[PDB]
């Protein structure tokens, strides 16, 4: 819909994932969830949003990178940023 | 936490509630939920957030008005806007 902070959430995950030689869930999630909370902790079901976005966003970002997407176009592909 | 769109959500509910001679749930909710979605429909549990915020935000706004809060300070009181 609006997307204005899903896009900041996505830009945040891209920073988390891209520089990492060893891409994997390995507690890159924890870092994602904290920065996700910081951006949406003030919602009644914030924790639940962030748990799900961690898998959805980071999974999507990782595969798009593997299949040749330019890192600065990934959030546009996903969310029209 | 961040609050940047809970504050737009609150400013939106204030517009919905304040001019209304007959303050009540009466499908002022529907209107709230649509404008809430527009602001957060792109989240995995958006509908759930909006259902809850409708009761939390509008209930809080209505009582604060009844007890003498200035309408332009209500979202500051609630969310530090």
Residue numbers in the entry:
A (entry chain A), B (entry chain A): 7 to 87
Question: Can you list sentences taken from the study reporting this PDB entry?
Answer:
In this study, we investigate the structure and biochemical functions of two SAPLIPs from human (Necator americanus) and dog hookworm (Ancylostoma caninum), Na-SLP-1 and Ac-SLP-1. The fold is comprised of a four- or five-helix bundle, where a kink in the third helix can lead to occurrence of two helices, α3 and α4. Three conserved dithioether bonds link helix α1 with the C-terminal end, helices α1 and α5, and helices α2 and α3.
Ac-SLP-1 exists exclusively as a dimer with an experimentally determined molecular mass of 19700 g/mol (MALS; theoretical M = 19062 g/mol). Buried within the dimer interface is a flat hydrophobic surface constituted mainly by the solvent-exposed side of helix α3. The most striking feature of the Ac-SLP-1 dimer is a long linear groove connecting the large cavities at their distal ends. Near the N-terminal region, a citrate molecule was found to occupy a special position on a two-fold axis. In contrast to the human hookworm SLP-1, Ac-SLP-1 does not possess a prominent cluster of basic surface residues, but rather three small isolated basic surface areas, comprised of Lys-17/Lys-21 (α1), Lys-36 (α2) and Lys-54/Lys-57 (α3). Ac-SLP-1, in contrast, shows no such feature and has a well ordered internal side chain packing. The trigger event that leads to disassembly of the membrane-associated dimers may come from the tryptophan residue at position 48, which sits in the link area between helices α2 and α3.
